[PDB]
Design a protein around this ligand. Structure first.
Ligand SMILES: [Zn+2]
Ligand SMILES: [Zn+2]
Lengths: 1130, 50, 61
């Protein structure tokens, strides 16, 4: 059970490492890294803008003196007043020309601007843990607040998710067509290179044409044979490339290798006196002439061939050639064994964006646009005027403010889900939303998402099905600074070059070593294993100054060693297995010392017990599933494993940790339970009476006592989402059917599961209308100052503030079928008047209200039974809720039963042997035996009542009782399942869904009932209902349903000649068109809908003439008919 | 099958075939070949597509 | 810590609630005189929520 304790140790706070709240920690840092460090590096630039003469006359733009400051008010003040919560950033800009002189440097100022006193940049600020921001180092924390939100301009709280980057870390394979394949990859500059440079390459291969194995891009590089390019870059023979490619491959690929090499040689020999440099130069010059580039040939060639691979800049060409060769090797292998190469939807080849990265990218883009606009303005001014004057009003609008506002609105490149307004359904949503990960539009459950994302927490319907995932409680996302990145990379390179001097120059039959896809060496195969092992050990001791470095050993036949240090990677802690030995079992002092140590203390003092492993490294390792299964293997079997995993309860999210024993039920029930656990009503906010927002609050909360550790560490349990109620599993007079439930009246009266709904109302009024002096029947609740009165109840026709347009009332109206109490009123006076009101209403359960358990047993109230109409036990206890038992066994929600038993046991003995309150641990993903739970319950009861018979003890343990009929006072046939359980109330209320219409407004164009429940619109009669009514044979019913109301009839005439609606001039019907032509057509009356006339007129607009005839059947007369019998002759 | 593929191939110049009974449970088909120019490129293609 | 009766059976639990919250006696000593399951659960799991002070005035112009 030591592994369980070690897992628990990771979830608790770790003050020594600056972790005060684990569930959101990685987010806080992700923002603290941007606002404090990366912004300064991005802004502080000193770059040329234009150059003249020959590198001796150039304009330079410099930015410096970057300062950022926080607001002067708390976020609660911002919420009440209606302000925004932003930090202010200011900087100074210099534009000056420089001329290179033999005496040194010549500087001639042209312009300078400052923003010392201005809102030069407004950056949204993250509230953070305890209502505390990174800029302000105060010393007061608001309890029960975890933050993770922003407040936008209009005083609206926003929250966002993580997103997956578009650039992958493995090349993408694709079958263009039969025997024609492509292989595309990307290159990006290191973090410390501003601006960042990108390149996107594609390799094309076709069996029919093996001389066109070509690498290409779009208007940034030549189309050249990759083998010849490698020859040019690395200066090696074709036979060398053949031997390198065909070294450790299956014999089926070697034929393709030989074909490719011989095709390259044939190309080589087709040119008289071939020379590689001449070949490349001719290609470059042909590209130069094809384009209209105005640069000199030398400039063009240097630009092309020096930025060939941004991620490997400042390295010799030979390493680039070998990188190309390895890419080709993987291309061929994936051609022949496609199923063994990382798929494009795999998580092995992806990285994730956190809060800080959105802002970082937006700042990058806006800075580039700013400098581009300045350059264009200067060029235009020089073209028209002289002296190179810089226009003002272009170097005062960087454009960051609009970008950040659009980001918080929900727009970010081609994604539209990054941020959203926070719906205040639950207290746990503050955790649930920031820990989600979205993927671009893939809906199948890929094996690589396991153990790092929750298996059961996914959307069940809508367009987002299978595109949003939730981290496990033990997962996280890496952060790293630029300076730390550089130091770590330097240390790794020094280690490689020092300890393996003689065996890193194979390049022909070795394993290439890459750091962030940058080839830096090639290792002797016979030493791969040692290199990894010795490496990982050093990683765990902090030898490199970072414990999250990832090292992967790919060996199928691709034969690569990959090292990752970047940010945006998923990492989990694992137990270490070293040479067929579990380190956790050979560290005796740990068991005695674990109590007084934190996670980082364990890492520092007991290395080699836990290792931080990222997803890619995980996918290629051998991992034992559990400690127990490990201890049952032979030493030879043990020697094959690298890691061992933690118990299963650590593979769930924080939302799924609310449930109990999800592995004893069906999976669909788990999905539904995760979906509804977020809709349960809880203690939403400590500022119930201060914050002016929508919300729902639980009135008399209770803390659950059958829980998992994650629910305890995240504080979800301390903020409550239900109450303990007594339930009986039985049928009640055949009433509680199809998920309906019976509820007790005295339980509702006393306060059972009582909630309060709070709503926000806002209006803007022109000042004259607010001050206008005339009592309409809608202004009954208004005080002498034109504002609604405190603590009054508003009805469905009342107004909140006086608004008279001049002698007419044009104010907005309250439109809920129930009343609400005015809790708070805030007013702002300006050119206009802005009024905000917070109202509250308590809502005891009624028919139609929705409840559920923690095992996805949801039901609505179907009957409110009096206390005297319910069955009771020998102690006189009647159930608060009655639920039909058949559904428990038809849906296979076994855990529910267990829950009840455990809860009952807790009631018998709720304290330790020391007398302290003792919760019962029943995790989701249980792993404990039912017999042990029964033994625990038996011990509890035996402690409670030492003198019990065997039958009584069995009945208590199994929670069985004899119930009596209240009407006759006689027992029922058999015993009933009866006991306490933690019960939840959902947010779907009847009165929020009720709708009715009698008469109202109409849409102007078509003259039909309008839409909108809040606007008194009607219900739509769809054409499927129309089909149903036609299936009954009721022609008149549907005819009258689709027609205009009989009360809206009027006389309309139509011309039988052209189909125009005849006009009425001076009371005379006349068709203008036909009268103009000297015709006298017949005008006839019609009875059709308005929309028909609109449609026909619009069709006439397009040029189509629609003409109607009318039936003139001759008269008919009735004639007597002889009789007919039709009966048989019997 | 083998003979029909070889006979109509456009990358083979001269060919011949024979069959032998290696033992009670194996059969050996032997093919003698000379390819058209270029030689080694066509040899690799043939061994790849056979 | 707010309701004065048990919501399931309607019994009076205010004296035990004072004995627990204000005098801070052991949960065992408190429950010594409570028999019904519902009442024991209520006295063991009920809390008063965490809340800030109210900003005044409630009507501000
Ligand atoms: Zn006409
Ligand atoms: Zn009670």
């Amino acid at each position: 059970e030591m592994d369980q304790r070690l897992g628990y140790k990771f979830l608790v706070p770790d003050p020594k490492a600056g972790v005060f709240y684990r569930p959101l920690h990685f987010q806080y840092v992700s923002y603290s890294n941007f606002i404090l460090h990366r912004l300064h590096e991005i802004l502080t630039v000193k770059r040329p803008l234009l150059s003249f003469k020959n590198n001796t006359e150039r304009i330079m733009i410099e930015i410096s003196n970057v300062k950022v400051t926080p607001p002067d008010y708390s976020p609660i003040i911002a919420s009440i007043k209606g302000k925004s919560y932003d930090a202010l950033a200011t900087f100074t800009v210099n534009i000056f020309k420089e001329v290179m002189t033999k005496e040194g440097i010549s500087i001639t100022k042209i312009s300078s601007y400052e923003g010392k006193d201005s809102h030069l940049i407004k950056i949204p600020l993250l509230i953070g843990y305890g209502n505390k921001n990174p800029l302000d180092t105060a010393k007061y924390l608001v309890p029960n607040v975890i933050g993770g939100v922003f407040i936008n301009k209009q005083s609206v709280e926003k929250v966002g998710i993580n997103l997956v980057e578009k650039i992958t870390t493995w090349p993408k394979f694709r079958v263009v067509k039969p025997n024609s394949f492509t292989f595309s990859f990307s290159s990006v500059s290191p973090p410390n290179v501003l601006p960042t440079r990108y390149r996107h390459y594609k390799i094309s291969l076709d069996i029919s044409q093996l001389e066109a194995l070509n690498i290409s891009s779009t208007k940034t590089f030549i189309t050249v044979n990759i083998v010849l390019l490698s020859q040019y870059l690395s200066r090696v023979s074709l036979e060398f490339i053949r031997r390198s490619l065909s070294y450790d491959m299956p014999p089926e690929v070697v034929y393709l290798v030989n074909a490719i090499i011989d095709s390259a040689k044939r190309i080589t020999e087709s040119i008289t006196d071939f020379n590689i440099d001449t070949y490349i130069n001719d290609l470059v010059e042909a590209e130069h002439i094809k384009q209209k580039s105005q640069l000199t040939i030398n400039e063009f060639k240097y630009e092309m061939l020096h930025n060939f691979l941004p991620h490997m800049n400042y390295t010799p060409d030979q390493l680039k050639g070998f990188y190309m060769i390895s890419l080709l090797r993987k291309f061929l292998y994936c051609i022949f064994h496609t199923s063994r190469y990382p798929d494009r939807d795999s998580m092995v080849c992806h990285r994730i964006l956190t809060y800080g990265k959105y802002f970082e990218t937006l700042a990058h883009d806006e800075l580039e646009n700013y400098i581009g606009n300045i350059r264009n303005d200067i060029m235009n001014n020089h073209k028209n005027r002289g002296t190179y004057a810089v226009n003002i009003h272009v170097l005062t609008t960087p454009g960051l403010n609009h970008a950040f506002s659009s980001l918080l609105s929900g727009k970010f490149k081609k994604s539209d889900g990054s941020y959203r307004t926070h719906p205040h359904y639950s207290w746990m949503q503050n955790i649930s939303i920031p820990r989600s990960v979205g993927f671009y539009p893939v809906r199948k459950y890929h094996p690589s998402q396991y153990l790092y994302f929750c298996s059961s927490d996914v959307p069940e319907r809508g367009p987002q099905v299978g595109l949003v995932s939730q981290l496990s409680v033990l997962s996280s996302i890496t952060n790293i600074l630029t300076s730390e990145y550089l130091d770590l990379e330097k240390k790794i390179c020094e280690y490689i070059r020092s300890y393996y001097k003689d065996d890193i120059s194979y390049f022909e039959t070795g394993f290439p070593i890459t750091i962030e896809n940058a080839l830096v060496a090639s290792l002797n195969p016979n030493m791969i294993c040692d290199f990894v092992t010795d490496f990982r050990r050093r990683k765990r001791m902090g030898f490199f100054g970072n414990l999250e470095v990832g090292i992967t050993l790919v060996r199928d036949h691709m034969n690569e060693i990959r090292i990752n240090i970047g940010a945006g990677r998923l990492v989990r802690p694992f137990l270490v297995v070293d040479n067929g030995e579990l380190m956790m079992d050979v560290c005796p002092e740990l068991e005695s010392r674990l109590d007084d140590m934190t996670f980082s203390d364990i890492q520092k003092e007991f290395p080699h017990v836990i290792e931080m492993v990222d997803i890619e490294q995980f996918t290629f390792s051998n991992v034992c599933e559990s400690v127990q299964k490990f201890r049952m293997m032979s030493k030879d079997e043990r020697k094959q494993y690298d890691l061992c995993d933690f118990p299963a309860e650590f593979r769930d999210g924080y939302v799924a940790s609310s449930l109990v024993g999800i592995n004893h039920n069906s999976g669909p029930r788990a999905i539904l339970g995760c979906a509804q656990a977020k809709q349960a009503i809880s203690c939403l906010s400590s500022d119930i009476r201060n914050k002016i927002d929508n919300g729902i609050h639980l009135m008399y909360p209770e803390r659950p006592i059958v829980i998992s550790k994650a629910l305890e560490t995240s504080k979800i349990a301390a903020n409550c989402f239900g109450q303990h109620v007594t339930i009986a599993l039985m049928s009640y007079k055949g009433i509680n059917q199809e998920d309906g439930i019976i509820i007790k009246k005295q339980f509702i009266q006393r306060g059972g599961l009582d909630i309060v709904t709070a709503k926000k109302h806002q209006v803007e009024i022109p000042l004259e209308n607010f001050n206008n002096k005339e009592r309409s029947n809608a202004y009954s609740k208004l005080e002498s100052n034109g504002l609604v009165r405190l603590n009054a109840f508003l009805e469905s026709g009342d107004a909140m503030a006086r608004n008279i347009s001049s002698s007419f009332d044009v104010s907005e109206k309250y439109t809920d079928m129930y009343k609400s109490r005015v809790e708070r009123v805030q007013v702002e006076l300006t050119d206009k008047v802005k009024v905000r009101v917070l109202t509250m209403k308590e809502r005891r359960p009624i028919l139609g209200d929705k409840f559920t358990t923690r095992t996805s047993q949801k039901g609505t109230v179907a009957y409110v039974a009096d206390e005297t109409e319910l069955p009771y036990d020998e102690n006189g206890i009647t159930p608060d809720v009655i639920i039909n038992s058949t559904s428990i066994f038809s849906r296979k929600t076994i855990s529910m039963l267990i829950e009840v038993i455990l809860t009952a046991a807790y009631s018998a003995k709720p304290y330790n042997n020391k007398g302290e309150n003792r919760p019962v641990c029943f995790p989701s993903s249980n792993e404990t035996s039912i017999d042990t739970y029964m033994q625990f319950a038996k011990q509890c009861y035996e402690h409670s009542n030492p003198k019990l018979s065997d039958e009584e003890l069995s009945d208590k343990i199994f929670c069985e009782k004899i119930l009596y009929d209240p009407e006759t006072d006689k027992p029922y046939a058999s015993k009933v399942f009866f006991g306490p359980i933690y019960y939840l109330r959902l947010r779907h209320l009847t009165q929020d869904k009720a709708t009715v219409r009698c008469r109202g407004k109409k849409t102007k164009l078509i003259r039909q009932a309008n839409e909108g429940r809040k606007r008194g619109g009607g219900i739509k009669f769809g054409e499927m209902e129309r089909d149903c009514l036609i299936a009954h044979g009721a022609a008149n019913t549907i005819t009258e349903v689709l027609k205009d109301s009989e009360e809206d009839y009027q006389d309309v005439y139509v011309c039988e000649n052209c189909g125009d609606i005849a006009a009425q001039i001076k009371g005379i019907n006349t068709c203008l068109r036909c009268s103009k032509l000297n015709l006298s057509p017949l005008l006839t009356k019609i009875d059709t809908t308005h929309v028909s006339k609109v449609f026909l007129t619009q069709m006439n607009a397009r040029g189509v003439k629609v003409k109607l005839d009318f039936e003139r059947r001759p008269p008919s007369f009735y004639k007597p008919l002889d009789k007919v019998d039709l009966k048989p002759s019997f | 099958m083998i003979e029909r593929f070889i006979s109509f191939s456009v990358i083979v110049k001269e060919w011949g075939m024979e069959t032998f009974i290696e033992d009670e449970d194996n059969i050996r088909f032997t093919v003698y070949l000379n390819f058209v120019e270029p030689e080694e490129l066509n040899l690799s293609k043939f061994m790849m597509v056979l | 810590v707010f309701q004065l009766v048990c919501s399931t059976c309607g019994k009076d639990i205010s004296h035990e609630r004072y004995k627990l919250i204000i005098r801070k006696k052991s949960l065992k000593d408190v429950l010594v005189s409570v028999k019904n399951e519902c009442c024991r659960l209520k006295l063991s799991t009920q809390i008063e929520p965490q809340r800030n002070l109210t900003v005044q005035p409630l009507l501000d112009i």
